[model samples]
Target: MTQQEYQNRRQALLAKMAPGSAAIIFAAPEATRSADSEYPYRQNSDFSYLTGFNEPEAVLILVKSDETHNHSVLFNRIRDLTAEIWFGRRLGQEAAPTKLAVDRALPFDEINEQLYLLLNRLDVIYHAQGQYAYADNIVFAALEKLRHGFRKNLRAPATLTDWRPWLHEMRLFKSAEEIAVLRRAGEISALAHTRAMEKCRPGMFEYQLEGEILHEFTRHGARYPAYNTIVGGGENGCILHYTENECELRDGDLVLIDAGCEYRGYAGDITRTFPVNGKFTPAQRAVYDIVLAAINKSLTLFRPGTSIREVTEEVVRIMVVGLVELGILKGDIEQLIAEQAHRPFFMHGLSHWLGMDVHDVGDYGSSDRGRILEPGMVLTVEPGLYIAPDADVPPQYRGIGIRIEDDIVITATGNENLTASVVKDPDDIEALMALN
Candidate 1:
């Protein structure tokens, strides 16, 4: 990302702000896994979107004091001589103005004293409430001071509106650069999935397969995943949010892997389920084919003029029909669909918006009219069927879970499958694993 790009976004934000208003965004704070150990820091999504700055303890303020008097201010950490050698390097307050291209820079430690001064006499402040507890605390502390400091002649602003509404409005549609990077992210994640499948074996633990996927991610320059990588073997797949990769792969069981990586600030999401022995049994293949068909059917509905709401209904019918044929659900097709009989088996939504976050920010406006698909939107189509070991269904089909997912970007004419390079067809999956 270029400094010029961030400068343009700041100006764009200020232009949307009302005169005498200021919009505040805070960077992510550091976290510790436990005492004396810290997790790697990742910047806040919105903060990283507006500015390319990746440090914690930083704030960006875009003020439109009046038509001709708008300016940007950044509060960042100062470079410490000893910490630089121990923890990591920082751009510091001095170089931030030059590199970050803001109008002014101040130390983060001076925020309590300087924020009230910067926002002095301003009528309103726009901030994403509770985005970070400490950041919100700072605003409340400043307001308390302004309320109590009578001799300074300062009064608290009359308004504090959440910045999230407009923030999502700005980030909903993807730019050309964003689309390009997301395409690369999808490609990288697909390769990682392929690696996981090739490395999978009958006796291996799920975590080792996760390691293979992570290695492939870093090999292609994705420093981290957009979310925790999920490797659920056998009945564990029934748990949608399962992240404990502690299960062991059994010879006849299926493994469901939902994984993706964050590349250049955008995210790529993919899910693939396959047999541990590199061959799907009769029962597993039947369930796998149904889910695969659902994904294939859903892909056509991702272009302009369609919504996920519409696609989901179609997928539900497909799932209900498949379940009925397998005797997993005993009911009429139309009546079963109306009752949402597939909910227990296919628990999660059919798809989700994909971007800087795996389940990215954007309004899936409740109504069909508000949710129309458009160009430059990226999302995942993942339809899964998880049959638990204790399920009352047929014994062969029990404990068989399957999901096939891919990333697609809506385009002017249609949509493109960014992760199609990886094999999803049953034969292709076995053929690729045969090489191992």
Candidate 2:
């Protein structure tokens, strides 16, 4: 994204913010993997959304003075040749203002010294308290110090509030540029899933397939996966959140993969389940088709003015009927649904906002029917069924699990499927794997 886009976002926030209020957001801290090693750095989503700066040990402050006056200030690390040689180069305070398009820049060391000065006299203080302990300390200390100075006629803001609601509300809607990057992410992830399916064999280890999936992601410029790759085979598929990826794929079992990649700070999440030997068994195909039908029926429900609650109800209604037809579920569909009888097999919600985070933030059930789906909002439509090995179902249907997920964006008329390139149809999957 361009600097102007970041500037525009800052301006938008300032415009909505009450005058004489200030907002402060901190960069992600470097987490230690072990004693000395550090995990890969990812900037905080909210921080990057407004500042476009990724460096750690930094803070972005926006102070709204009045209708026409606001200041975007950045406090970042100081340049150190020794630290640079040991770690990496830092965007020092000197170049941060012009490079990051902030109104002013100062060394991070100066935050404690300057925070009170910037916040005093403001009517409200906006910060996500307790998100970062260090940041919380800085903010609280500044407020406390400002309070101390009030004895000498200094003014301190009277209110402290959480800024996440406002910031996340902005993030819930995607910009054209964000949608483009999300498209690329979905495309790369789709190809990765296709490659994994084509490379699958009966005797291969689950981790081997995971390795193939990650290879495709990195080869396509996606350096990190949005979440841990799940390569569950057979009974392992019945275990949600299974990531062992250690079992050998059996010829008669199905493989469930729920994986996606993070490209350029955006996330793409897609899940596809298929047979280990490239051809689904009779029972596997039955369960798979039911989930696919649920997904297909739910996709048509995504559009402006629809609510996620409504989409989920539609998906559940379809799945319950399919399960009864397959003898996996018994009793009247409406009665079973009222009792949530499908929870054993069809667990998890139908969708979640998708963006920088795999399970991105947004209000879901706060309202009577949950938040209304609007244009430019992206989400996932994942409907799944998992039958445990010891369930009272028929032998052929036991230990079977299937899920089909797709990334979708609500459009003016309807919605756009970003993962349409991926082949989810059983015939397509078998044919593609046959080539290998």
Candidate 3:
């Protein structure tokens, strides 16, 4: 993102902020894995959105000076040659203003001494409370200092607001530049799925496919995945959050891969299920077609006015009929739906907002579908059915799971399916897998 975009976002926040208000955003804290070595660092999404800065142990403050005048301050690490040599290079306070578009930059060491002073008489304070206890601890410490320091002529803002709601509302709608990045993220993730299809073999372990997917992502310049890659084979596919991809993929069993990539701070989530032996059996094809149809039908309805809840209702009916036709479910169609019989097979939400984070945040409101669709909103449409091996209904349909997912963006006319390049058609999947 350009410095201009970050500045514009700061200005937008300032416009909505009370005249004598201040907003505080903190960077992600560094985390460690098992030994002394640290896990790879990822910047906080909200902090990155506003500053376009990627570093730990930092803070940003936007101060609205009563009216038309507003400015930003950044507190970052000071220059240290030894620390720079031990870790990566450092962009100290001297360079933060030039690089991050802040009005002035100070060392983080002075935060305890300078933070509350900056908030001396502000009317309100915007803080995303409880996200990190340490952050709250520091802010409260500063507030207490101001509360008792009459010598310093300090006073604390009585009104503290949760900044997430406002910031997330802004993030829900993607800009043109954000869409372009998301489209690229989707394309990269889609290609990874296609590569897995072509490379999969019956005797291969699930992690082998996971490796192929990671290779495709890094090969396309996406350094990391949006989340843990899931490659569930056979009955393991019934487990929604299954990440233990160590089991062998048998010849006739179906494998489900739910994976995506993180490109330029945005995310792409897609899932595909296919036969291990490159040909879906009669029972597998029947179930797969139902899930595929749900995805296709839902994609068309994602334009505007409709919502995930509405699309999900349509998919529930489709699954109920498909299951009944196969003798997997019995009883009156309406009665079965009224009883919510589809919950056993299709239990997850049909869609979710997708952006910088996989399950990106936005207010869905009290009831489902309360938030109306609008242009520039990106979401995922995923529909699936998992028939457990121990299910009592039908032996033929046992131990099969299928999910077809795609990422889409609401546009002026209707919607654009960003991941449509990867074919979901049964014939196309077979043709592509035939090369294995």
Candidate 4:
């Protein structure tokens, strides 16, 4: 994000607070996965939004409502030449203020004293606590100290309000910079999908495709998979959140993959289904067409005024009609609708807010949390149908599952398709795969 953009976001945040309030955000901490192995540290989205700093173990304090207002202070690790030699370069104290655009930068050790100096003179504290234990310990200690010393008109802020709603709601919408990064994320993942399509064949292990997906993610600057990669083959596709297993992909089966890549801290969620043997069988093509139809029709309902519920309403209706058309349901639309007949196959919400985290951080809809689609919002329109191998369905529809997903950015005029380079049409998929 540009300096102007971060400045504008800070102004917006300050506007949300009361007249005599200050907001504080904490950065993520490094954790150990095992005895000596450390889990890769990811910067907290809320903190990064203001600081544009991706390093862990940092804190941002913006005081906009004190006697001397409009101050932004950053407390983070200072430069350690020895640690840098062992690990990597640090921004240090001097480089952070100019590089990160903070008004003042201090070492992490100064948080307690600096925060105390400000909070003792303020009326309210706008604290947004994350799931990190060390941050909680630091902030709570400051609060406890203030509670103990309250006699000389010096005390903790009377109000301890959570700034989650104020900040998280703002994050739900993507800015132009955010969208640019997300578009690149989609493009990289599409390359991975195309690679998987070309290389996947009958008798290949499911885990090989998993390697292809990760290759694209890490090769193109994404540090890790946005979420667990799903490489479900045949009946495994019926499992919505399926992880790749040791089973060999069968020539007659369809492979359903749900994978994504995060670029520059922004996330992209995409899913694609293809025939393992490179050409879709009659049954596989039929099932895939239904899923494609559901996804396409649902996207039509993604305009500015539409809510996710509205899109889901139309998607479920399409699924019902598709099942009835395929003869899986024996009766008219009313019978299928009355029976709630689609649960066994299609499950999970249609989409989620995709950004800093795969799931990201935000409520779906308005202040009431209802998933209303607005301009600048990005979401996955995935509609799938999965049927078990031994179900009481027709022989032709057995053991087939398909999901077609695309990342779309909502716009005033319409939606932008970020994954258009990837083949989704059954004929196009076969044509692309047959190239090798």
Candidate 5:
């Protein structure tokens, strides 16, 4: 997005702040990996949303004291010749205002003093309480100082409000440009999964497949994966969040890969399971088909005005019936569903909001039922069945875990699957892997 887009977001947020209210947003700190080394810096999503500024030790202040004007100030690190040589160039106060499209800019060191001046003009403070303790301390200390000096005409803002709801609500809806970038991210992730499938073979370590996936992501310009890539072979797939990727792929065993890439701050998540040896046994295919059907059922039901809670109930019902048909579940379908007998196999929710963060922020509504799915909202449709090794299942089906996931966007008429390019059909998966 352009600088103007960032400015526009700021304006929208500022307009929400009541008159005589102010907000403070801080940049993410550089986390140390070892003594002198540090992890790669990523700007805080909320901070980046408003300013498009990626530097550390930066803060954004927005104040609306009257209907006539709203002011935006940026406090950033000052240029230091020695620090520049050791680290990198800094956008000092001089360039930040023009470059970031803020009304004013100041050295980050002046934040404490400036807060006293700015806070004096407002009646309330808006911040994400408990999110950043360091930032919270700074604001709290400032407030305390103001309170102690009330005899000197200083007054602390009377209220502290959470700013996340307002910002997150805005983020939940994707603009045309946001959706376009998300599409690119999904495409790159799909190709990466396809590459992993084509390159799979028995006796190869899981990490090797993970390396292949990451190679495709970086080469396609997505500098990082959205999360740790899961390339689990055999029973390892049953372990959620599996990242060791150290086991060897074996003949007749299936590998489940849950991975995605982050492109331009947007995320794309997809999961595909296939036989490690380019062909599934009858047992693997049966379990795979059931999971696939569940995903298809959920996809067909996704559209504007549908609640996630309602979709989840229907998805669970489908999975229970499929399990009964396969003889894995051996009771009346409705009775078993009411008893939640399928919990052991299908344990997670049917979907989650998706965007800048893998599990992005957005209220699902009251506990009675989730909010309706709306156009511009992106989410994931993942349904899985994980048969435990100790379960009372046929020997062939034991230890088989299958999950099919695709990113989806709710639309006015229906919905769109962003990761559909990665083939999920059992025949297609086997045929694609056969070429290797």
Candidate 6:
């Protein structure tokens, strides 16, 4: 991101606060997994949005003054040769200010000593405290120190004055740069999905294909799966969130893969299912085609101004009609829709916000904390059905499960599918598998 991009975001955030209030943003710390072992480090998303810096043990403070206007101040650790040998070289205090272009910079060791001096004159303080343990302690300590003499004069921001009302609302709509990063991540994930398809064959272990998916992701710069990759084959596919001793994939049985690739904190969720032998059996084809039909039916309703409820209802309608044709369900479509009886096999919502996090951080509708489908927002349109292993129905359909998902963006005219480059059709799937 450019310096101007950071300046603009910081300005936008400051503009949201109540008059005379100041704000602070902090990065997350490296977490330890076991003795002397650390989990992979990741920067806080909100912090990165405002400062473009991706290091740990860093803080950014924005002070808005009636006298001096506003300026951003950054604090970080000074370089240590011993620490660098053990850990890694730091940006250090000398280079941090010039490189990050903050108005002023200080060493992290001095934060506690100088915090109150910095915050005492402010009318209200805006901070992201409760989200991280270290940040919570630092912000609260600083506030307590500032309140030592005039507790009544120094005020904490009201819960209603929280940044969620502003920052989250802002994040709901992706910036052009953010969309560009997501599209790159989406394309990488699409390639991984297609690679998994190529390696799939009857008698292959489910876990082996999981390796192929992960390999494809890491080979192309993705850190890991956006979520636990679901490599459910045959009966295992019926279990949503399945991640364990996978059964052997057999001919004529369907394979459902719910996998994604995450790069630079953005995520892409894509799912596709097909027969293990590159040819769907009669019953498997019946179920797979039904789900595909539902996907096409649902996409028609994904244009702007459509409510989440409306989009979901359309997908349910397609599934309901398909169920009746297969004899698994028998009833009036209107009556069944009212009762929501199709939920037994067809579970999970129609879609979810997709971005920094796999499930992202947005809502489906206008609830107390939900967001609408505004332009530039991205989401996953995943429609699935799982039929548990049973003997009452046709053998092919009983143990088969199918899901087809794609990443999409809400555009001014309609919506764009980011993963359209990945082929998911039966013919494409069969041809792709011929490679392996």
Backbone atom clashes (below 3 Å) for every candidate: 0, 0, 0, 2, 0, 0
Segments in model 6 whose C-alpha atoms lie over 4 Å from true places = 66-68, 150-160, 245-247, 366-372, 390-396
Q: Tens digit of lDDT per residue, candidate 5, span 1-436?
A: 8876787788888888889988899998888999999988878889977876789999999989777688888889999999999899999988887888888999888888877777874688999888887899889988887888778798888899988999999999988888999999999999999999999989999999999999999999998999999998889989878899999999978999999998988899999999999988998898899889888988999999888888888888888888888889998988998999999998888788899899988887875448998999999999999997787987778989889999998989889999999999999998898777
- All-Cα superposition RMSD per candidate: 1.5, 1.4, 1.0, 2.2, 1.3, 2.7
True lDDT of residue 39, candidate 3:
80
Compared with the true structure, what per-residue lDDT tens digits does model 6 show for residues 1-436?
6787778787888876655667878888888999999877777878877777877888998887754378778888789999999888788878877798888888888888776677766677777547888877887887776556464465433331346556665666888888988898889988988887888888998999889899999988997777889999888888888887367888867888888887877888999998788887778877888788877776666777776667788788888888878877778999988888778878787788888778876545554223455688888888988877873554556877788999898998778899878887777777777766
| Model 5 deviation from native, Cα RMSD in Å | 1.3
Q: Which is better, 1 or 6, measured by lDDT? A: 1
- Which candidate ranks first by lDDT, i.e. highest? 3
Residue-wise lDDT of candidate 4 within 1-436, one digit each (tens)? 7899898888889888777677888887777999988988777878878777878768888887644468788888889989999988889789888887788888887777766776775688888665677877777788777788777566777788889898888888889988998999999988888888998989989889999888878888986878788999998988888885568999888999888887887877788999988888887888788888888887676788887777787787888888888877767787787687887878777767777887767887553236667899887788888888997888888888788888888999778888878889889999998996
RMSD of 4: 2.2
The 10 consecutive residues of candidate 3 with the worst lDDT sum are 362-371
Give TM per candidate.
0.97, 0.97, 0.98, 0.94, 0.97, 0.91
Q: Which ten residues in a row have the lowest lDDT in candidate 1?
A: 363-372
Could you tell me the lDDT of residue 91 within candidate 4?
A: 90
| Error of model 3, residue 173, in angstroms | 0.2
Worst 10 residues of 6 by lDDT: 154-163
Positional deviation of residue 183's Cα in model 1 after best superposition, in angstroms: 1.2
Question: Which is the better candidate, 1 or 3, if ranked by TM-score?
Answer: 3
Pick the TM-score winner.
Answer: 3
Which scores greater on lDDT, model 1 or model 2?
Answer: 2
